[PDB]
Design a protein around this nucleic acid. Sequence first.
RNA 1: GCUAAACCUAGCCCCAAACCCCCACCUUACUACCAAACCUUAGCCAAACCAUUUACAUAAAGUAUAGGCGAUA
RNA 2: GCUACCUAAGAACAGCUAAGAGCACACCCGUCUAUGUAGCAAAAUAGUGGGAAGAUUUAUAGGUAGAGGCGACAAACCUA
RNA 3: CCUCCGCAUAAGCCUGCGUCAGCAACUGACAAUUAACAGCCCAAUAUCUACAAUCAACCAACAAGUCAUUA
RNA 4: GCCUGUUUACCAAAAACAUCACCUCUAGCAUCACCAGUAUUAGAGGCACCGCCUGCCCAGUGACACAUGUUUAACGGCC
RNA 5: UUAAUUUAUUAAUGCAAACACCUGCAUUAAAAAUUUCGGUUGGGGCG
Lengths: 236, 76, 50, 45, 117, 243, 95
Amino acid sequence: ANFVSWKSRTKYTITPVKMRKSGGRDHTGRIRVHGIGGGHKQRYRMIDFLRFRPEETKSGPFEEKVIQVRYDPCRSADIALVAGGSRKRWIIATENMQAGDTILNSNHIGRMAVAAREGDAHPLGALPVGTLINNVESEPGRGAQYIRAAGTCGVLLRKVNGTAIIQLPSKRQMQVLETCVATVGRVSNVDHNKRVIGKAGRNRWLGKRPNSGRWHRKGGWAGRKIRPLPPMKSYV
Amino acid sequence: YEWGVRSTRKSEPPPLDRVYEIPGLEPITFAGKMHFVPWLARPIFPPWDRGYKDPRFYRSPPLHEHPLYKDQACYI
Amino acid sequence: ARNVVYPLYRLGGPQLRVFRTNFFIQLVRPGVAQPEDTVQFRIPMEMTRV
Amino acid sequence: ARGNEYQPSNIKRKNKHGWVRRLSTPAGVQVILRRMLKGRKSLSH
Amino acid sequence: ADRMSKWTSKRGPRSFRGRKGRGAKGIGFLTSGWRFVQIKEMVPEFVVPDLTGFKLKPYVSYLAPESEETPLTAAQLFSEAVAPAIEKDFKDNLEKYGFEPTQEGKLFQLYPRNFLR
Amino acid sequence: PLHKYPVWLWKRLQLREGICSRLPGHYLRSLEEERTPTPVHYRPHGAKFKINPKNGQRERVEDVPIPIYFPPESQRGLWGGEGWILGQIYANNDKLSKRLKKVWKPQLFEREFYSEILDKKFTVTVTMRTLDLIDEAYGLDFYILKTPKEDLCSKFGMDLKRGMLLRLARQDPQLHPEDPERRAAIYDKYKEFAIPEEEAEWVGLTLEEAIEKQRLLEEKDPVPLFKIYVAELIQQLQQQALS
Amino acid sequence: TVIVERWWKVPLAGEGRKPRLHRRHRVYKLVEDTKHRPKENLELILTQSVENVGVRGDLVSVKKSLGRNRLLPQGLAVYASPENKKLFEEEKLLR
RNA sequence: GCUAAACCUAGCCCCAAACCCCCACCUUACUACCAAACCUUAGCCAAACCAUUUACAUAAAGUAUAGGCGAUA
RNA sequence: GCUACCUAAGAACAGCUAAGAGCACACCCGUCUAUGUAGCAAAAUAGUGGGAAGAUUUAUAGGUAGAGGCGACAAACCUA
RNA sequence: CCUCCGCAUAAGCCUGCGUCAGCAACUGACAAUUAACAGCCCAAUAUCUACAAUCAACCAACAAGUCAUUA
RNA sequence: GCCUGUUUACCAAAAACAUCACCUCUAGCAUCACCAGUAUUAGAGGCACCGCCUGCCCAGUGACACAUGUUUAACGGCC
RNA sequence: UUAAUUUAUUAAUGCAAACACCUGCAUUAAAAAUUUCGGUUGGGGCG
Ligand SMILES: [Mg+2]
Ligand SMILES: [Mg+2]
Ligand SMILES: [Mg+2]
Ligand SMILES: [Mg+2]
Ligand SMILES: [Mg+2]
Ligand SMILES: [Mg+2]
Ligand SMILES: [Mg+2]
Ligand SMILES: [Mg+2]
Ligand SMILES: [Mg+2]
Ligand SMILES: [Mg+2]
Ligand SMILES: [Mg+2]
Ligand SMILES: [Mg+2]
Ligand SMILES: [Mg+2]
Ligand SMILES: [Mg+2]
Ligand SMILES: [Mg+2]
Ligand SMILES: [Mg+2]
Ligand SMILES: [Mg+2]
């Protein structure tokens, strides 16, 4: 096959990027994921999930300004164009985030807590324990790889010596280092859950082909599996 | 999170043949031939420069040999 | 000339010159009505307009 | 409607069956060798 | 669907009919706007002598005598071309006699041909 | 019909016709030899004859080798005399069950060595049996200079043999510069493997790489016949001057 | 290493002939895997004031992991060849 | 008496002997010109099924051997 | 190069009433009847029909290959 | 007297009802389609490209979109 | 059978398949699919919009956990 | 498929080997692979 991935832009850019659909196919051209393909055309907004990065020849905590909260076709949560200093970047928006809002992107772990606003980012040692957080890193500098969908939120259950313990929306606990950045509040586009697809065509507009008609018999996997809660996983 | 996947970056050249690690011997490559041969070593070519000047194959100097490069950045 | 490898030209090189012309020419009669100032030839394939 | 099948285009013919594709893989190289050993006039499209 | 016919320029679609041409030669290059630049020096100048007072007609009269074929080997052309110069400069640096070891600075090179025909 | 010569001779005939006929004879001898490696994947028998238990009569035995597959990763490093065994098993070690095929791959270790002759630490993918042979040879330089080309069975190992042999042959003072005594200690230590500089350059080349080397030797920009004919003519007039 | 053995015995070929093999002489039987043998110590000579493995000039028996992995790369020990044991017995006669 | 019939030599086969053979063309082959190769064959079939198995000079000799100790090798 | 699904970048959808809306062309399909059955056709013709701004239809190039692909499962389609 | 066809371009085909000669377009010879349309393009290295389309204005959305530079 | 749609090219267009909706299971994660996504997500299935509802059961199987137990909108059974 | 023989294959462990990966040897599954489906019978199936 001749599959060259579209994910090739090296430099970060504010602009939408023409992206190529996969159809569920591999680089070898065979289907690996069923039920993908044929939706409305989309362009990719590059999101800076590493929420605290400084620009060139600047450092420390820095304020930023929300220019426009914008729909994103590539995910469930809508996004905000956020400009600061000499750079615009797309970040993912929290619940009540308006145009003209101002956000503190911080790095200093205070000796006290930081009674933060709805949409700013802080290291996990700088929060009151029991606040609703989102966009949680796994390592310091890793980037936000957790709790990123629409309306979700995680809660900070307890923080120990060099340690925070997040509760993911799957209600599995996570042990992260104290000095990684998360944002407070819940993610925007709430009531994405209470959304009626209405017809099969609107399900086809999203790039979601219908299921196969092959009648499968349900085996032992298909009960009501009440499991005990999984043990708390650490990244220390 | 670096942008750009591994499969679309510049492909890494294959590792050098273990002939080149030995100091005493001069390697035997397909530079004596003028084409690839898979059962000979791959030679190391000197960095070739076009001697003359050609307009449709001009390659500009990097952004310090340009004779007006101010370190103090202007905003235009 | 035809069936001859032409020497490659780089910028600033000498004029490419043919001394003994390989290809011939023949002027045929026009089978259709044509203007009085027009001569029709049968160029052999490798011979351009210039 | 059946039997129309062959629906011609020269791009799909050269890129499906042409010489450069037959020499792209060693299986097609062996195809060209069977054509020359049989003695055919056209080894490829 | 043909195989036997020669793949000529008259045959493909527009993109195929454009690229392939006849046995002509390139005269210039394409630039933006598809604008063709014709390079003057790539055009062959037909160097044509003056045909005035020239007394060789395209045929030879039948009264000319028959002789033998002696093709010009390298020993003949060395002999009549160089050998009396060697004999006259020997009875009293090989570049003195018309020999050039290298010919990179030469205009009309013998190997490889940079002249035409 | 038939051929004049049989087919398995044809490659040997290729070592007589053209560029291979101008190869030096000590190289072509080193390709014409057919000797067997040391048994690696099978116990060799003791003697040629063997008295079997079923009828008590002595019968001659040989030691048929196991076909060993060498992937090109074995030519990147120094394995032993070993590679993958491509074979078959019976399923429960009785033959009346299913026959089913198995590849026994050797266990690899990316180790590091120091060649005192070539004066360099190499990083070599190696086997445990190779390390045992290095200990049995008392050094990797002795192990590469002692093993025969067939037995050692690596492209890189024959490259190391060619480099060490050229280092010992020329007595190169680039081994340890500004220290000739240490070079004389090394060069006296491996004195036993002294080989002429003609013969050492052809050690461990493949046949095609030796055709390339022989072709690069005897290629010349051809002589213009002006120099030849001037030689003939001044020599001819010196023959005239003696008349 | 892996030492295998043929199930089906090969009919013997002669003095100047190689044994031609059928597809049943490809059926092998694992007689020994050398890695599962009781491993052996190797003899060395330390050349410094090393740990309890030995002192200067002594030939000893070391595990192959410590011997190959630490001593021989770091120049602490030399192999127990017959050639250097002469030099170190002659070192012991200089005492 | 129409259709037709006939024909003899192109060639071929098996041996022996002897070791053979200007220009454009891997891009859409027949186009003047720009930044990487090696990896057990399997199965049909015979065993009246099939499942281990099943062939790929002379003479010793179809001997020693091997083998659902059987087909067979 | 058909067909099943996909990729890229394209295109078409009159008029009338007022949205995977209705009537209705073009276009896509093929319910039912009849003709045809070595036929015009190795599946067509005539009429009737279902849809026709959408999960539409379609041109072009590319991808998936047989121990497989592909499938809104008919165990379909993968050059009659 | 029919026309639901026609004329072009695309794709395909490759001289296949032009002249001369030999149920009631085949052979030989000769001749032609002429670029303005359409193919055949682009000097690097950094740096820019948040605001659909629908007469684009009110509106009204969602499936979130076909179009650009600078040193 | 909710609907529009899909299918056996060339004997079946259907009540079959799909489908909004609902339910069950699996998964705490980056650089070639899923996805440049992160549990309101993704994938594997069942049933078929919405409205009133979905009763009882772990004996057996299979899964889950090895607290001999949990599981039915799992296979299935309900004198 | 709960027919027979397998587990070459993947994925898990376990033990060696080596100081997690790889390799060897066992075990468990999942995916499969090979092969078969006796006879009489007032036709065959049932008995
Ligand atoms: Mg579903
Ligand atoms: Mg279903
Ligand atoms: Mg088509
Ligand atoms: Mg049989
Ligand atoms: Mg049978
Ligand atoms: Mg409608
Ligand atoms: Mg009906
Ligand atoms: Mg309608
Ligand atoms: Mg379909
Ligand atoms: Mg069905
Ligand atoms: Mg059926
Ligand atoms: Mg219905
Ligand atoms: Mg249909
Ligand atoms: Mg049908
Ligand atoms: Mg029907
Ligand atoms: Mg249904
Ligand atoms: Mg009966």
